Amino acid sequence: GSSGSSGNMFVALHTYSAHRPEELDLQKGEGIRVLGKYQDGWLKGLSLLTGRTGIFPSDYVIPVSGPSSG
């Protein structure tokens, strides 16, 4: 089963309890959608699971791959 649409998929594989009103709560095994790029080491994405948008560490998110590309 492939996502289908062309976008950006990034998992968390970790439980991060947001500490600030800007941070995003990550959940081990949750699909996140990277929207903007905060900076080297920090990115902005919307948790496709919970539905929250915040800044999470790139180290926590890994760039997935698949037949998406041509």
Short mmCIF file of all heavy atoms in Angstrom, two decimals:
data_model
loop_
_atom_site.label_atom_id
_atom_site.label_comp_id
_atom_site.label_asym_id
_atom_site.label_seq_id
_atom_site.Cartn_x
_atom_site.Cartn_y
_atom_site.Cartn_z
N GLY A 1 0.81 -1.21 0.00
CA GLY A 1 0.00 0.00 0.00
C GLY A 1 0.84 1.26 0.00
O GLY A 1 1.62 1.50 0.93
N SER A 2 0.69 2.07 -1.04
CA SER A 2 1.45 3.31 -1.16
C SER A 2 0.55 4.52 -0.94
O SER A 2 -0.62 4.51 -1.31
CB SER A 2 2.11 3.40 -2.54
OG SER A 2 2.85 4.60 -2.68
N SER A 3 1.11 5.56 -0.32
CA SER A 3 0.36 6.77 -0.04
C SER A 3 -0.51 7.17 -1.24
O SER A 3 -1.71 7.42 -1.10
CB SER A 3 1.31 7.92 0.31
OG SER A 3 2.19 8.20 -0.76
N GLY A 4 0.11 7.22 -2.41
CA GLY A 4 -0.62 7.58 -3.62
C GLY A 4 -0.24 8.95 -4.13
O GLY A 4 0.47 9.07 -5.13
N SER A 5 -0.71 9.99 -3.46
CA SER A 5 -0.42 11.36 -3.86
C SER A 5 1.06 11.67 -3.69
O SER A 5 1.77 11.00 -2.94
CB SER A 5 -1.25 12.35 -3.03
OG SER A 5 -2.55 12.49 -3.58
N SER A 6 1.53 12.70 -4.40
CA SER A 6 2.93 13.10 -4.33
C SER A 6 3.15 14.16 -3.26
O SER A 6 2.67 15.29 -3.38
CB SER A 6 3.40 13.63 -5.69
OG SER A 6 4.81 13.57 -5.80
N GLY A 7 3.86 13.79 -2.20
CA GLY A 7 4.13 14.72 -1.12
C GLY A 7 5.37 14.36 -0.33
O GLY A 7 6.32 13.81 -0.89
N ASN A 8 5.36 14.67 0.96
CA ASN A 8 6.50 14.37 1.82
C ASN A 8 6.06 13.60 3.06
O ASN A 8 5.26 14.08 3.86
CB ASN A 8 7.20 15.67 2.24
CG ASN A 8 6.22 16.82 2.42
OD1 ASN A 8 6.13 17.71 1.57
ND2 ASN A 8 5.49 16.80 3.53
N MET A 9 6.59 12.38 3.21
CA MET A 9 6.25 11.54 4.35
C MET A 9 7.44 11.40 5.29
O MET A 9 8.57 11.19 4.86
CB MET A 9 5.80 10.15 3.87
CG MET A 9 4.34 10.09 3.45
SD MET A 9 3.25 9.65 4.82
CE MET A 9 4.00 10.58 6.16
N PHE A 10 7.17 11.53 6.59
CA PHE A 10 8.22 11.43 7.60
C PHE A 10 7.65 10.89 8.91
O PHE A 10 6.72 11.45 9.48
CB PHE A 10 8.87 12.79 7.83
CG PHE A 10 9.74 13.25 6.70
CD1 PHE A 10 9.18 13.85 5.58
CD2 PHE A 10 11.11 13.06 6.74
CE1 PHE A 10 9.98 14.27 4.54
CE2 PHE A 10 11.92 13.48 5.70
CZ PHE A 10 11.35 14.08 4.59
N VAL A 11 8.23 9.79 9.39
CA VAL A 11 7.79 9.17 10.63
C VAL A 11 8.54 9.74 11.83
O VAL A 11 9.53 10.46 11.66
CB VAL A 11 7.99 7.64 10.60
CG1 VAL A 11 7.19 6.98 11.71
CG2 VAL A 11 7.59 7.08 9.24
N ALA A 12 8.07 9.42 13.02
CA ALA A 12 8.69 9.90 14.25
C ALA A 12 9.50 8.80 14.92
O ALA A 12 10.65 9.00 15.30
CB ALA A 12 7.64 10.45 15.20
N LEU A 13 8.89 7.63 15.07
CA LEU A 13 9.55 6.49 15.70
C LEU A 13 10.06 6.86 17.09
O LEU A 13 11.05 6.32 17.57
CB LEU A 13 10.71 6.01 14.84
CG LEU A 13 10.44 5.95 13.33
CD1 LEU A 13 10.75 7.29 12.68
CD2 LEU A 13 11.26 4.84 12.69
N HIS A 14 9.37 7.80 17.74
CA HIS A 14 9.75 8.24 19.08
C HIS A 14 8.63 9.04 19.73
O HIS A 14 7.83 9.68 19.04
CB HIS A 14 11.03 9.08 19.02
CG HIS A 14 12.28 8.26 18.98
ND1 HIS A 14 12.52 7.21 19.83
CD2 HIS A 14 13.37 8.35 18.17
CE1 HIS A 14 13.70 6.68 19.56
NE2 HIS A 14 14.23 7.36 18.56
N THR A 15 8.57 9.01 21.06
CA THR A 15 7.55 9.73 21.80
C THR A 15 8.11 11.02 22.39
O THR A 15 8.77 11.00 23.43
CB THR A 15 6.96 8.87 22.93
OG1 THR A 15 6.65 7.56 22.44
CG2 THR A 15 5.70 9.51 23.50
N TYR A 16 7.83 12.14 21.73
CA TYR A 16 8.31 13.44 22.20
C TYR A 16 7.16 14.27 22.75
O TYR A 16 6.25 14.66 22.02
CB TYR A 16 9.00 14.19 21.06
CG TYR A 16 9.53 15.54 21.46
CD1 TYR A 16 10.82 15.68 21.98
CD2 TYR A 16 8.75 16.69 21.33
CE1 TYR A 16 11.31 16.92 22.35
CE2 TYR A 16 9.24 17.93 21.70
CZ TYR A 16 10.52 18.04 22.21
OH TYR A 16 11.00 19.27 22.58
N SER A 17 7.20 14.55 24.05
CA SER A 17 6.16 15.34 24.70
C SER A 17 6.46 16.83 24.58
O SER A 17 7.25 17.38 25.34
CB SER A 17 6.05 14.94 26.18
OG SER A 17 5.93 13.54 26.32
N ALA A 18 5.81 17.48 23.63
CA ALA A 18 6.00 18.91 23.41
C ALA A 18 6.16 19.65 24.73
O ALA A 18 5.37 19.46 25.66
CB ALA A 18 4.83 19.48 22.62
N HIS A 19 7.18 20.49 24.81
CA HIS A 19 7.44 21.26 26.02
C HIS A 19 7.06 22.73 25.83
O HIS A 19 6.73 23.43 26.78
CB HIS A 19 8.91 21.15 26.41
CG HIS A 19 9.39 19.74 26.58
ND1 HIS A 19 8.64 18.77 27.21
CD2 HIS A 19 10.53 19.14 26.19
CE1 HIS A 19 9.31 17.63 27.21
NE2 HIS A 19 10.46 17.83 26.60
N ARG A 20 7.11 23.19 24.58
CA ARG A 20 6.77 24.57 24.26
C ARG A 20 5.56 24.63 23.34
O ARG A 20 5.19 23.66 22.69
CB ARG A 20 7.97 25.27 23.60
CG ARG A 20 8.90 25.95 24.59
CD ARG A 20 9.88 24.96 25.20
NE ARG A 20 10.61 25.53 26.33
CZ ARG A 20 11.66 26.33 26.21
NH1 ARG A 20 12.11 26.65 25.00
NH2 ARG A 20 12.26 26.81 27.29
N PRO A 21 4.92 25.81 23.28
CA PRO A 21 3.74 26.03 22.44
C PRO A 21 4.08 26.03 20.96
O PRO A 21 3.21 26.26 20.11
CB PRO A 21 3.25 27.41 22.88
CG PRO A 21 4.46 28.10 23.41
CD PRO A 21 5.31 27.02 24.03
N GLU A 22 5.34 25.78 20.64
CA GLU A 22 5.79 25.75 19.25
C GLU A 22 6.26 24.35 18.86
O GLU A 22 6.25 23.99 17.68
CB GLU A 22 6.93 26.76 19.04
CG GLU A 22 8.25 26.33 19.66
CD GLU A 22 9.41 27.19 19.22
OE1 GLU A 22 9.28 27.87 18.18
OE2 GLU A 22 10.45 27.18 19.91
N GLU A 23 6.66 23.57 19.86
CA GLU A 23 7.12 22.21 19.61
C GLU A 23 5.96 21.29 19.25
O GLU A 23 4.81 21.56 19.59
CB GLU A 23 7.85 21.67 20.85
CG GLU A 23 9.24 22.25 21.04
CD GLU A 23 9.92 21.75 22.30
OE1 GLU A 23 9.20 21.39 23.26
OE2 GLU A 23 11.17 21.71 22.33
N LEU A 24 6.27 20.19 18.57
CA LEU A 24 5.26 19.23 18.16
C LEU A 24 5.41 17.92 18.92
O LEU A 24 6.52 17.43 19.11
CB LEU A 24 5.34 18.97 16.65
CG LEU A 24 4.03 18.60 15.96
CD1 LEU A 24 4.28 18.29 14.49
CD2 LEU A 24 3.38 17.41 16.65
N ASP A 25 4.29 17.35 19.35
CA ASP A 25 4.30 16.10 20.09
C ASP A 25 4.43 14.91 19.14
O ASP A 25 3.51 14.61 18.37
CB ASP A 25 3.02 15.96 20.92
CG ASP A 25 2.76 17.18 21.78
OD1 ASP A 25 2.22 18.17 21.26
OD2 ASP A 25 3.10 17.14 22.99
N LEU A 26 5.58 14.24 19.19
CA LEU A 26 5.83 13.09 18.33
C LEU A 26 5.38 11.80 19.01
O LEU A 26 5.46 11.67 20.23
CB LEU A 26 7.31 13.01 17.98
CG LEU A 26 7.95 14.30 17.46
CD1 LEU A 26 9.45 14.10 17.25
CD2 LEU A 26 7.28 14.75 16.17
N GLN A 27 4.92 10.84 18.21
CA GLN A 27 4.46 9.56 18.73
C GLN A 27 5.09 8.40 17.97
O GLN A 27 4.93 8.29 16.75
CB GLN A 27 2.94 9.47 18.66
CG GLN A 27 2.22 10.38 19.64
CD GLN A 27 0.77 10.00 19.84
OE1 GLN A 27 -0.13 10.73 19.43
NE2 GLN A 27 0.53 8.86 20.47
N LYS A 28 5.82 7.55 18.68
CA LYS A 28 6.47 6.40 18.07
C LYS A 28 5.51 5.64 17.16
O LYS A 28 4.64 4.91 17.64
CB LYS A 28 7.02 5.46 19.15
CG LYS A 28 8.25 4.69 18.72
CD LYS A 28 8.40 3.39 19.49
CE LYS A 28 9.63 2.61 19.05
NZ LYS A 28 10.88 3.19 19.61
N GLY A 29 5.66 5.83 15.86
CA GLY A 29 4.80 5.15 14.90
C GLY A 29 3.69 6.05 14.39
O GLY A 29 2.56 5.60 14.20
N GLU A 30 4.01 7.32 14.18
CA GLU A 30 3.03 8.29 13.69
C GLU A 30 3.53 8.97 12.42
O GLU A 30 4.68 9.39 12.34
CB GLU A 30 2.73 9.33 14.76
CG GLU A 30 3.73 10.47 14.80
CD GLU A 30 3.28 11.62 15.69
OE1 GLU A 30 2.24 11.47 16.36
OE2 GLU A 30 3.97 12.66 15.71
N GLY A 31 2.65 9.08 11.43
CA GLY A 31 3.02 9.71 10.18
C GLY A 31 2.93 11.23 10.24
O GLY A 31 1.88 11.78 10.57
N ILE A 32 4.03 11.90 9.94
CA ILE A 32 4.08 13.35 9.97
C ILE A 32 4.35 13.92 8.58
O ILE A 32 5.05 13.31 7.77
CB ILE A 32 5.15 13.86 10.94
CG1 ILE A 32 4.90 13.32 12.35
CG2 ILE A 32 5.18 15.38 10.95
CD1 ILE A 32 6.15 13.24 13.20
N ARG A 33 3.79 15.10 8.31
CA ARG A 33 3.98 15.75 7.02
C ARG A 33 4.78 17.04 7.17
O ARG A 33 4.28 18.04 7.67
CB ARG A 33 2.62 16.06 6.38
CG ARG A 33 2.66 16.08 4.86
CD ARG A 33 1.27 16.26 4.27
NE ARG A 33 1.26 16.09 2.82
CZ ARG A 33 0.15 15.98 2.10
NH1 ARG A 33 -1.04 16.03 2.69
NH2 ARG A 33 0.22 15.84 0.78
N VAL A 34 6.04 17.00 6.74
CA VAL A 34 6.91 18.16 6.83
C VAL A 34 6.46 19.27 5.88
O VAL A 34 6.45 19.09 4.66
CB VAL A 34 8.37 17.80 6.51
CG1 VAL A 34 9.18 19.04 6.18
CG2 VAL A 34 9.00 17.03 7.66
N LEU A 35 6.08 20.41 6.44
CA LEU A 35 5.63 21.54 5.64
C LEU A 35 6.75 22.55 5.44
O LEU A 35 7.27 22.70 4.33
CB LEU A 35 4.44 22.22 6.32
CG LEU A 35 3.51 21.31 7.13
CD1 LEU A 35 2.88 22.07 8.28
CD2 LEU A 35 2.44 20.72 6.23
N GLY A 36 7.13 23.24 6.51
CA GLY A 36 8.20 24.22 6.42
C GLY A 36 9.49 23.72 7.03
O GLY A 36 9.53 22.66 7.65
N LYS A 37 10.56 24.50 6.86
CA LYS A 37 11.87 24.14 7.40
C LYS A 37 12.38 25.21 8.35
O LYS A 37 12.79 26.29 7.92
CB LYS A 37 12.87 23.92 6.27
CG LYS A 37 14.30 23.75 6.74
CD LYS A 37 15.29 24.05 5.63
CE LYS A 37 16.69 24.27 6.18
NZ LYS A 37 16.84 25.62 6.79
N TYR A 38 12.36 24.91 9.65
CA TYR A 38 12.83 25.85 10.66
C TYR A 38 14.30 26.18 10.46
O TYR A 38 14.67 27.33 10.23
CB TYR A 38 12.60 25.27 12.06
CG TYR A 38 12.46 26.33 13.13
CD1 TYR A 38 11.42 27.25 13.09
CD2 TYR A 38 13.37 26.41 14.18
CE1 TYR A 38 11.28 28.21 14.07
CE2 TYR A 38 13.24 27.37 15.16
CZ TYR A 38 12.20 28.27 15.10
OH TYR A 38 12.06 29.23 16.08
N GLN A 39 15.15 25.16 10.55
CA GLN A 39 16.58 25.34 10.38
C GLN A 39 17.31 24.00 10.41
O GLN A 39 16.69 22.95 10.59
CB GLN A 39 17.14 26.25 11.47
CG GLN A 39 16.91 25.73 12.88
CD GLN A 39 17.32 26.72 13.95
OE1 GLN A 39 18.50 26.82 14.30
NE2 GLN A 39 16.35 27.47 14.47
N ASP A 40 18.63 24.04 10.24
CA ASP A 40 19.44 22.82 10.25
C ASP A 40 19.27 22.07 11.57
O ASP A 40 19.85 22.45 12.59
CB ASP A 40 20.91 23.17 10.03
CG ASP A 40 21.20 23.56 8.59
OD1 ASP A 40 21.26 22.65 7.73
OD2 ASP A 40 21.37 24.76 8.33
N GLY A 41 18.48 21.00 11.54
CA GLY A 41 18.25 20.21 12.74
C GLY A 41 16.81 20.29 13.21
O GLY A 41 16.36 19.43 13.97
N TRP A 42 16.10 21.32 12.77
CA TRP A 42 14.71 21.50 13.16
C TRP A 42 13.83 21.75 11.94
O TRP A 42 14.17 22.55 11.07
CB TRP A 42 14.58 22.67 14.14
CG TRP A 42 15.24 22.41 15.46
CD1 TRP A 42 16.49 22.81 15.85
CD2 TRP A 42 14.69 21.69 16.57
NE1 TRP A 42 16.75 22.39 17.13
CE2 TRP A 42 15.66 21.70 17.60
CE3 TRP A 42 13.48 21.05 16.80
CZ2 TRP A 42 15.45 21.08 18.83
CZ3 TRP A 42 13.27 20.44 18.03
CH2 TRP A 42 14.25 20.46 19.02
N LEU A 43 12.69 21.06 11.89
CA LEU A 43 11.76 21.21 10.78
C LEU A 43 10.33 21.36 11.28
O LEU A 43 10.02 21.03 12.42
CB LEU A 43 11.86 20.00 9.84
CG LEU A 43 13.27 19.48 9.57
CD1 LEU A 43 13.22 18.09 8.96
CD2 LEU A 43 14.04 20.43 8.67
N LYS A 44 9.45 21.86 10.41
CA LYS A 44 8.05 22.05 10.76
C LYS A 44 7.16 21.12 9.96
O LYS A 44 7.19 21.11 8.73
CB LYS A 44 7.64 23.51 10.52
CG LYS A 44 6.14 23.74 10.62
CD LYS A 44 5.80 25.21 10.58
CE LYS A 44 4.47 25.50 11.26
NZ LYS A 44 4.10 26.94 11.19
N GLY A 45 6.35 20.32 10.67
CA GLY A 45 5.46 19.39 10.01
C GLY A 45 4.17 19.19 10.77
O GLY A 45 4.07 19.54 11.94
N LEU A 46 3.17 18.63 10.09
CA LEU A 46 1.87 18.38 10.71
C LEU A 46 1.65 16.89 10.95
O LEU A 46 1.60 16.10 10.00
CB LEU A 46 0.75 18.94 9.83
CG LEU A 46 -0.66 18.44 10.15
CD1 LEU A 46 -0.85 17.02 9.65
CD2 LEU A 46 -0.93 18.52 11.65
N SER A 47 1.52 16.51 12.21
CA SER A 47 1.31 15.11 12.57
C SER A 47 0.02 14.58 11.97
O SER A 47 -1.08 14.98 12.36
CB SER A 47 1.27 14.95 14.10
OG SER A 47 1.63 13.64 14.48
N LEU A 48 0.15 13.68 11.00
CA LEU A 48 -1.01 13.10 10.33
C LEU A 48 -1.81 12.22 11.29
O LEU A 48 -2.91 11.78 10.98
CB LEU A 48 -0.57 12.28 9.12
CG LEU A 48 0.34 12.99 8.12
CD1 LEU A 48 1.21 11.98 7.38
CD2 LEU A 48 -0.48 13.81 7.15
N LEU A 49 -1.24 11.98 12.47
CA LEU A 49 -1.90 11.15 13.48
C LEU A 49 -2.74 12.01 14.42
O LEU A 49 -3.97 11.95 14.39
CB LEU A 49 -0.86 10.38 14.29
CG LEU A 49 -1.40 9.54 15.45
CD1 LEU A 49 -0.47 8.37 15.74
CD2 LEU A 49 -1.57 10.40 16.69
N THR A 50 -2.08 12.81 15.24
CA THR A 50 -2.77 13.69 16.18
C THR A 50 -3.41 14.87 15.47
O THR A 50 -4.54 15.24 15.76
CB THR A 50 -1.81 14.21 17.27
OG1 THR A 50 -0.56 14.60 16.67
CG2 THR A 50 -1.56 13.16 18.33
N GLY A 51 -2.67 15.46 14.53
CA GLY A 51 -3.19 16.59 13.78
C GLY A 51 -2.65 17.91 14.30
O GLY A 51 -3.26 18.96 14.09
N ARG A 52 -1.50 17.86 14.96
CA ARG A 52 -0.88 19.06 15.51
C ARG A 52 0.31 19.50 14.65
O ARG A 52 0.98 18.67 14.03
CB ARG A 52 -0.42 18.82 16.95
CG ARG A 52 -1.51 18.25 17.84
CD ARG A 52 -2.72 19.17 17.90
NE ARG A 52 -2.44 20.39 18.66
CZ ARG A 52 -3.28 21.41 18.74
NH1 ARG A 52 -4.46 21.36 18.13
NH2 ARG A 52 -2.96 22.49 19.45
N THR A 53 0.56 20.80 14.62
CA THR A 53 1.67 21.35 13.84
C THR A 53 2.69 22.03 14.74
O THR A 53 2.36 22.96 15.48
CB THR A 53 1.17 22.35 12.79
OG1 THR A 53 -0.02 21.85 12.15
CG2 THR A 53 2.24 22.62 11.74
N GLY A 54 3.93 21.58 14.67
CA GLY A 54 4.98 22.16 15.48
C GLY A 54 6.37 21.91 14.91
O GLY A 54 6.50 21.38 13.81
N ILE A 55 7.39 22.30 15.65
CA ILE A 55 8.77 22.12 15.21
C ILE A 55 9.41 20.91 15.89
O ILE A 55 9.48 20.84 17.11
CB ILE A 55 9.62 23.37 15.50
CG1 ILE A 55 9.41 23.84 16.94
CG2 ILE A 55 9.29 24.48 14.52
CD1 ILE A 55 10.37 24.93 17.37
N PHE A 56 9.87 19.97 15.08
CA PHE A 56 10.51 18.76 15.60
C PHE A 56 11.90 18.58 15.00
O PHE A 56 12.21 19.08 13.92
CB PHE A 56 9.65 17.53 15.29
CG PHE A 56 9.12 17.51 13.89
CD1 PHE A 56 9.95 17.21 12.82
CD2 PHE A 56 7.78 17.79 13.63
CE1 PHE A 56 9.46 17.18 11.53
CE2 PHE A 56 7.29 17.77 12.34
CZ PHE A 56 8.13 17.47 11.29
N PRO A 57 12.76 17.85 15.73
CA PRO A 57 14.14 17.59 15.29
C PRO A 57 14.20 16.65 14.10
O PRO A 57 13.56 15.60 14.09
CB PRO A 57 14.78 16.93 16.52
CG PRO A 57 13.64 16.32 17.26
CD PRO A 57 12.46 17.23 17.03
N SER A 58 14.97 17.03 13.08
CA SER A 58 15.11 16.23 11.88
C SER A 58 15.65 14.84 12.21
O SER A 58 15.34 13.86 11.53
CB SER A 58 16.05 16.92 10.88
OG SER A 58 17.39 16.86 11.32
N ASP A 59 16.44 14.76 13.27
CA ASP A 59 17.02 13.49 13.70
C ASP A 59 15.93 12.50 14.10
O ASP A 59 16.12 11.29 14.04
CB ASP A 59 17.98 13.71 14.87
CG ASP A 59 19.38 14.04 14.42
OD1 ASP A 59 19.52 14.80 13.43
OD2 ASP A 59 20.35 13.55 15.04
N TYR A 60 14.78 13.03 14.52
CA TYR A 60 13.66 12.20 14.93
C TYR A 60 12.84 11.75 13.72
O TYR A 60 12.12 10.75 13.78
CB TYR A 60 12.77 12.96 15.91
CG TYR A 60 13.29 12.95 17.33
CD1 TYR A 60 14.57 13.38 17.63
CD2 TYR A 60 12.49 12.52 18.38
CE1 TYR A 60 15.05 13.37 18.92
CE2 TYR A 60 12.96 12.51 19.68
CZ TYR A 60 14.24 12.93 19.95
OH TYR A 60 14.71 12.93 21.24
N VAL A 61 12.95 12.50 12.63
CA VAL A 61 12.22 12.18 11.41
C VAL A 61 13.17 11.71 10.31
O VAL A 61 14.21 12.31 10.08
CB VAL A 61 11.42 13.40 10.90
CG1 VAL A 61 10.14 13.56 11.69
CG2 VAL A 61 12.27 14.66 10.97
N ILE A 62 12.79 10.62 9.64
CA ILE A 62 13.61 10.07 8.57
C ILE A 62 12.88 10.13 7.23
O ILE A 62 11.69 9.83 7.13
CB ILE A 62 14.00 8.61 8.86
CG1 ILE A 62 15.30 8.25 8.13
CG2 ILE A 62 12.88 7.67 8.44
CD1 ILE A 62 15.86 6.90 8.51
N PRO A 63 13.60 10.54 6.18
CA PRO A 63 13.04 10.65 4.83
C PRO A 63 12.73 9.29 4.22
O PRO A 63 13.64 8.55 3.84
CB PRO A 63 14.15 11.36 4.04
CG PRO A 63 15.40 11.02 4.78
CD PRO A 63 15.02 10.92 6.23
N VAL A 64 11.45 8.97 4.12
CA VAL A 64 11.01 7.70 3.55
C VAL A 64 11.17 7.70 2.03
O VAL A 64 11.37 8.75 1.41
CB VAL A 64 9.55 7.39 3.90
CG1 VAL A 64 9.40 7.17 5.40
CG2 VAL A 64 8.64 8.52 3.43
N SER A 65 11.07 6.52 1.43
CA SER A 65 11.21 6.38 -0.01
C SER A 65 10.21 5.36 -0.56
O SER A 65 9.60 4.61 0.20
CB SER A 65 12.63 5.96 -0.38
OG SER A 65 12.87 4.61 -0.02
N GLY A 66 10.04 5.34 -1.88
CA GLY A 66 9.12 4.42 -2.50
C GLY A 66 8.95 4.67 -3.98
O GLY A 66 9.69 5.45 -4.59
N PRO A 67 7.96 4.00 -4.59
CA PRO A 67 7.68 4.14 -6.03
C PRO A 67 7.10 5.51 -6.37
O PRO A 67 6.86 5.82 -7.54
CB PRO A 67 6.65 3.04 -6.29
CG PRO A 67 5.99 2.81 -4.98
CD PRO A 67 7.05 3.06 -3.94
N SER A 68 6.88 6.33 -5.35
CA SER A 68 6.32 7.66 -5.54
C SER A 68 6.93 8.33 -6.77
O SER A 68 6.22 8.81 -7.65
CB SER A 68 6.57 8.53 -4.30
OG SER A 68 5.77 8.09 -3.21
N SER A 69 8.26 8.35 -6.83
CA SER A 69 8.97 8.97 -7.94
C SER A 69 8.73 8.18 -9.23
O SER A 69 8.34 7.02 -9.20
CB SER A 69 10.47 9.04 -7.65
OG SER A 69 11.09 7.78 -7.86
N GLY A 70 8.96 8.84 -10.37
CA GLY A 70 8.76 8.19 -11.65
C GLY A 70 9.89 7.23 -11.99
O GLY A 70 9.66 6.02 -12.12
#
